[PDB]
Each structure stands twice: as structure tokens, then as C-alpha cells.
Design a protein around this nucleic acid. Structure first.
Ligand SMILES: [K+]
Ligand SMILES: [K+]
Ligand SMILES: [K+]
Ligand SMILES: [K+]
Ligand SMILES: [K+]
Ligand SMILES: [K+]
Ligand SMILES: [K+]
Ligand SMILES: [K+]
Ligand SMILES: [K+]
Ligand SMILES: [Mg+2]
Ligand SMILES: [Mg+2]
Ligand SMILES: [Mg+2]
Ligand SMILES: [Mg+2]
Ligand SMILES: [Mg+2]
Ligand SMILES: [Mg+2]
Ligand SMILES: [Mg+2]
Ligand SMILES: [Mg+2]
Ligand SMILES: [Mg+2]
Ligand SMILES: [Mg+2]
Ligand SMILES: [Mg+2]
Ligand SMILES: [Mg+2]
Ligand SMILES: [Mg+2]
Ligand SMILES: [Mg+2]
Ligand SMILES: [Mg+2]
Lengths: 141, 183, 63, 52
RNA sequence: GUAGGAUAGUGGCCUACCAUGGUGGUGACGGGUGACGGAGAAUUAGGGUUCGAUUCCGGAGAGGGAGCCUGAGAAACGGCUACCACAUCCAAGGAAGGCAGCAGGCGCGCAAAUUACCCAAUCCUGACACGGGGAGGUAGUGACAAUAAAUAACAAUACCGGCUGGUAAUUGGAAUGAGUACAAUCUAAAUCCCUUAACGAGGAUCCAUUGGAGGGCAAGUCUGGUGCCAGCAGCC
């Protein structure tokens, strides 16, 4: 059973402090490992496109999910980023400048795409959404 | 230091906890259409004010009847509700504050009053008249439909003295038509 | 509309006004003339004159 | 033994989709008038609102 | 602990001699902090959780250290001296440096504005009622955040539903601010706001968008295309 002594406040505080580490959410935000991850605790990161890659969809689906290999400028790390929307991979080229955001699940894969935790938001300073709707045009240079 | 930084501001409404309650949506649309509101934000702002007042009254009712703080704040709140027409003289207890509904506050809007006294053919007509500077409360022109009319000021509502419906100088359309007809 | 509010001062005589009123208010009434000057130019002239000693300091600030 | 999926297929359906022009329709009222229309449609005049 | 030195002054602050003491699972000592502390901020049954660089208070720093003069007050940096790192000019002999002040530039990055006007207000300062003040204020950029609030209102006609309501790029005249502009007002001077001559609305082109329509969760078993492809899908 719990300790209940009126003079046992120290033990209760220490026990809670020790047991907090069993909590995964608490440990994630108190171990200081977010700075060694590709984004280093940022909502977005810019990078250079290295190569277009197709990723097979997970069972029971069957598709080729279009993604890009991006090297982050600020630390040189390499990640896989999904390119959403139909035919939007055609707006991406090798050595292009892309803005990368999270996939929405805080560092975890989404949907039937395996091992992909990022998506492309902008290419060459123009949002992919504008390119898909023809609102803007990708800069020639 | 920038002295402007010391000015304070606050929010006036909150979004619903559950966005897509069908019954809540139906009731809110009914109220908005009845009172001719432009969006749900106005209704939520009125609900926020009503909730604040009801919370204050409920907090006061928890204190002892002879508590000086309860006496002072209850008198202040009852006077405030009486000034704006929310409560009648017979409704002289903090308990009746808890029985206040959003409709009570909505009925005190300058738009609703302008519609009710007969200066407008409809609630929307009252809205457009108010926002077009055709209405004055006392000697002051008011163009804010959300204006809450006090009991004393209710009987002073009238057409603006500088408006076609309150004085002379018809509108630009009428003047243009008169000029055109002069030939 | 149709109403306005403000502040007014009536001095016993013009000399008292000239002695107590701000310069800009006197200018507004025509009792004083606005002198055209640039604060940045004054600062630059002062800084330039800082480096010159003696009577020549007077024309040093011109540059 | 097929051509299931590849990078060269990007934009297939969107390119295939025939282009249909948008019909020119009168603008709906905004704000209070829009709310008035909604209230009249759902309460005064009157299955789902988009039933066939 | 004793006696001295130094200090504005107490004190191992320092010196000489003497004693073996001092802290520690009631966590010392050591390490980390993407740690300046507080007043406070977010959320609120209660208890709690998370945040606090930033305008108020206290501390520290002026590229990194160290030393110091003047002075009531500084170990000052829009003061000096030396070293270290950067770094401008040179007639090559020398000579001058410190934006974590206001602007502004490079760099960095997801990430942040004008090299403007003024001491008119608040206050500070000097020999001084008067000078000065990038403190501070004004104006510029500004969908951080917050407040109010347009994009239509009313009749006739025709359709519909029970005199009463709803619809119509059908008709009819009324109203008005977005804009524009004399003028005045505002203002240190301007500008904006407020006020207001003359203009300013019918597809009132003065044309509202962002997301969605299997469920969670409000909204189509509509039509065409594609055919585990392309794609969607926070989860199913
Ligand atoms: K598969
Ligand atoms: K499937
Ligand atoms: K001492
Ligand atoms: K001693
Ligand atoms: K500190
Ligand atoms: K002195
Ligand atoms: K600067
Ligand atoms: K001043
Ligand atoms: K859904
Ligand atoms: Mg001593
Ligand atoms: Mg702090
Ligand atoms: Mg820091
Ligand atoms: Mg700052
Ligand atoms: Mg401070
Ligand atoms: Mg210092
Ligand atoms: Mg520096
Ligand atoms: Mg130095
Ligand atoms: Mg120093
Ligand atoms: Mg400096
Ligand atoms: Mg200084
Ligand atoms: Mg920003
Ligand atoms: Mg806002
Ligand atoms: Mg519009
Ligand atoms: Mg539903």
C-alpha cells in the first residue's frame, strides 16, 4: 500500500519523481534527445532534394508513394519526405530547395507509407498547394 | 519601454467545445435568424457575457447571507441588471440572475429595440438603418447594433436629426433623381 | 457630428502669452515665425565642430 | 508481370481527367443576409439538405 | 583560535603561529540544464500541470580575460593600459579600433520592421525658467495578439406553402459607406481618426474565402474520368 505518514512527504515526492520516468511522454520531453533529431526541435526545416524515390504502400494497400530524399541545410542530415497531391512530384527536381514539415503524428509514420515522417511544404520558395492549384508558378531559376 | 505595451486587452468569446452538435447548431441558427445576427461569433459573445454574469452570481450565492462581500457585490450586480432592463424590480434576488437566458440579453440590443418599437419593418431593416447612421439613442448617433440599451435610454431612441428619416437633406440618390427630373 | 470640444486660454495681455505660452502655439497665432531647421543637420554640424578648436571651430561645422 | 507502379506514372489521373468549365452562377449574399437565407431555408420554408 | 596587515568598515579577506577541525542517504561533493531569479503567463471542480528571453524589481555583461586613473560614486568600456581573437587606414615610417544603444548591413537560420521626424507630451540632466536627450514620443512596415463591424434593406409582379410566409441576373424607386476631395479639424510640423461642401451601387463586376460532404463529425447511396494505377486517408 501507499505510504501515509505525516512526516513522509519526502518519500512521496521522491517516489513520484522516480516513477515519472516510466511515462513515455514525460521522458521524451525531459531526456534532451530532441536536439539530436533531424529537425532539432523545430516545426520546419529547409533542405536540398537529392533524389526522387518511390516507396511501396503497406498491406493491404498497393501503391507507389512518391517521396524525395532531402538533406537538411542546418545539420546535413538526410530524411525521406512525402510529396502529397496528384502529380506534384513533377514540381520537384534534384538540387531543388524545399521546406519540410512534420507529417502530423509527432515523429511517427502516417497511413500506409512506411518509415516516412516528413512532407514537402514548399519548393523553390513556392508552396506546393499553390503549384497544385496553378495559383503560382515555379521560378525558372 | 514602450508605454503602449501597458494597455491590456481580452477576448470576448469562445468556440464551442464540440464543433458539430446538430441540436446546438439548430438552436444557434434559430437564434441568429430570429435576431438577425451576422455570424455565430455574436451569439457566442453574448453567451460569454451571460456565463460570466451567472458565474459571478453563483459564486456570490455560495457565501454567507451576512457576508459583507456578498452584500456589496450582490447589490452591485442587481443594480447592473436593473439598469439594463435584464431584471424587473420584483426580481430583486440574486437567485433570479441565474434564471437569465441569452434571449434576455439579445432583447436589449439596439437592433432588436429598433425593430420592436416600429422604426423598422424587419430586424434586418433595423440593422441596416443602425449601421447607416439613421438612429440616435439620445442626442448621440449610434451605429453599433450590439449597443446595449439601458432602461432610461430606451424611450429616447429616435431618427438621426441629420438623416432623411429624422430631418431634411434627403439622400444622394433622391437628390440625383430630383436633379435628373428637373430637365 | 454637430458638436465639438476643446481647451481655451485667455491671457491678461499679449506679453504674458509670449512669456508663458509654448513657441508652437504662438506661431499658430502668428505672434512668432517658424524657423526652418533640421535636427540631424544640427547634430552633424555639432559633431564636425567637435574636432576643431578655437575661433575656426565656427566654420569647422559647415564643411 | 505487369506495370503496376513507378515514378513515371506521377500525374496520371489528373492529366487524364477531362477539363470541365465552371458554371457562371450568381453570387450568394454574405454575412447577415446569408444567415437569413439559411434560417429561412431550414426553419421557415421547411431528408438531408443535399438529398437526391 | 591568538596577534597583526589591508579595507569605508566585519570576516581566513591576507600574513605568522597554533589546534584538527568543517560537510555528508535529512543526498554532501561531482555532473547536466536548449538554467539569469522574482513580480507573473496559459489551463482552471478541488488538488494540480506547463511556461516565464522580453517594457516592473533585483543581478550580471559590454568581442575574451586582466589592471587601473578620475571621481561622492566605476574595477566604467559611446574611459584608459596590456595580452589574446578579429579587424580599418597607410605615402609602409606609423596611426586608429569595439552596435548585447537607435536605424541599417552580412551571416545564421522556420523565425522578426525605416539607415524617417521631434523634443510638442512624460521625465532626466547641466552654470541652467532658456541648451541637450535615437531616453521617450510621432509617423513608416506590421492578418503576432485583441476590439467593433460592410458585402445589402424595402415594395410591385409571377410562382409556390399555410391575411400570412419563402424564391426569382423581373420591375420600382429609397438608404448608405469602401473610395474620392474642397474645407475645417488633428498635429511640434505632417499623417490618420472624427466632422463635412461636390461626386461615389443593380449581375449593386463595389463579384468572400478557408476547409470539408463513409464514421468519429455537419453535409450527396448525384453525374463524368481513372481502374490496388494515379491518388486520398490525423485513426478506422
Ligand atoms: K502492399
Ligand atoms: K486497399
Ligand atoms: K574588514
Ligand atoms: K583569525
Ligand atoms: K542570475
Ligand atoms: K564628482
Ligand atoms: K543597431
Ligand atoms: K521634452
Ligand atoms: K468525417
Ligand atoms: Mg582582525
Ligand atoms: Mg525573466
Ligand atoms: Mg538563452
Ligand atoms: Mg529584445
Ligand atoms: Mg531590468
Ligand atoms: Mg559593468
Ligand atoms: Mg559582438
Ligand atoms: Mg575587450
Ligand atoms: Mg571593462
Ligand atoms: Mg557601443
Ligand atoms: Mg554606458
Ligand atoms: Mg514573423
Ligand atoms: Mg486578429
Ligand atoms: Mg466583396
Ligand atoms: Mg453526419
Amino acid at each position: 500500500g501507499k505510504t501515509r505518514g505525516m512526516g513522509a512527504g519526502r518519500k512521496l515526492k521522491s517516489h513520484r519523481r522516480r516513477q515519472r520516468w516510466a511515462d513515455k511522454s514525460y521522458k521524451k520531453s525531459h531526456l534532451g534527445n530532441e536536439w539530436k533529431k533531424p529537425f532539432a526541435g523545430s516545426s520546419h526545416a529547409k533542405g536540398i532534394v537529392l533524389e526522387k524515390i518511390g516507396i511501396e504502400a503497406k498491406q493491404p494497400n498497393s501503391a507507389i508513394r512518391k517521396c524525395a530524399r532531402v538533406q537538411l541545410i542546418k545539420n546535413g542530415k538526410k530524411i525521406a519526405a512525402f510529396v502529397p497531391n496528384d502529380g506534384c512530384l513533377n514540381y520537384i527536381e534534384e538540387n531543388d530547395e524545399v521546406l519540410i514539415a512534420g507529417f502530423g503524428r509527432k515523429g511517427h509514420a502516417v497511413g500506409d507509407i512506411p518509415g516516412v515522417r516528413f512532407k514537402v511544404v514548399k519548393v523553390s520558395g513556392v508552396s506546393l498547394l499553390a503549384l497544385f492549384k496553378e495559383k503560382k508558378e515555379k521560378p525558372r531559376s | 519601454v514602450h508605454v503602449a505595451f501597458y494597455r491590456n486587452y481580452g477576448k470576448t468569446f469562445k468556440k464551442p467545445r464540440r464543433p458539430y452538435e446538430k441540436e446546438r447548431l439548430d438552436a444557434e441558427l434559430k437564434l441568429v435568424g430570429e435576431y438577425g445576427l451576422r455570424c455565430k461569433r455574436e451569439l457566442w459573445r453574448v453567451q460569454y457575457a451571460l456565463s460570466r454574469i451567472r458565474n459571478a452570481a453563483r459564486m456570490l450565492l455560495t457565501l454567507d447571507e451576512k457576508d459583507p462581500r456578498r452584500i456589496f457585490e450582490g447589490e452591485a450586480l442587481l443594480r447592473r441588471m436593473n439598469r439594463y432592463g435584464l431584471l424587473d424590480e420584483s426580481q430583486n434576488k440574486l437567485d433570479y440572475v441565474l434564471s437569465l437566458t441569452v434571449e434576455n440579453f439579445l432583447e436589449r440590443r439596439l437592433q432588436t429595440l429598433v425593430f420592436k418599437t416600429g422604426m423598422a419593418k424587419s430586424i434586418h431593416h433595423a440593422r441596416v438603418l443602425i449601421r447607416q447612421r439613421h438612429i440616435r439613442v439620445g442626442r448621440q448617433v449610434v451605429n453599433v447594433p450590439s449597443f446595449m440599451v439601458r432602461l432610461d435610454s430606451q424611450k429616447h431612441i429616435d431618427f438621426s436629426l441629420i438623416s432623411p428619416f429624422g430631418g431634411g437633406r434627403p439622400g444622394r440618390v433622391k437628390r440625383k433623381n430630383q436633379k435628373a427630373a428637373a430637365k | 457630428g454637430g458638436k465639438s470640444t476643446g481647451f481655451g486660454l485667455i491671457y491678461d495681455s499679449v506679453e504674458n502669452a509670449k512669456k508663458y505660452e509654448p513657441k508652437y502655439r504662438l506661431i499658430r497665432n502668428g505672434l512668432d515665425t517658424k524657423v526652418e531647421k533640421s535636427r540631424k543637420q544640427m547634430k552633424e554640424r555639432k559633431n564636425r565642430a567637435k574636432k576643431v578648436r578655437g575661433v575656426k571651430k565656427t566654420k569647422a561645422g559647415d564643411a | 508481370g505487369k506495370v503496376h507502379g513507378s515514378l513515371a506514372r506521377a500525374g496520371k489521373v489528373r492529366g487524364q481527367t477531362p477539363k470541365v468549365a465552371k458554371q457562371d452562377k450568381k453570387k450568394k449574399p454574405r454575412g447577415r443576409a446569408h444567415k437569413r437565407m439559411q434560417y429561412n431555408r431550414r426553419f421557415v420554408t421547411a431528408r438531408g439538405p443535399n438529398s437526391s
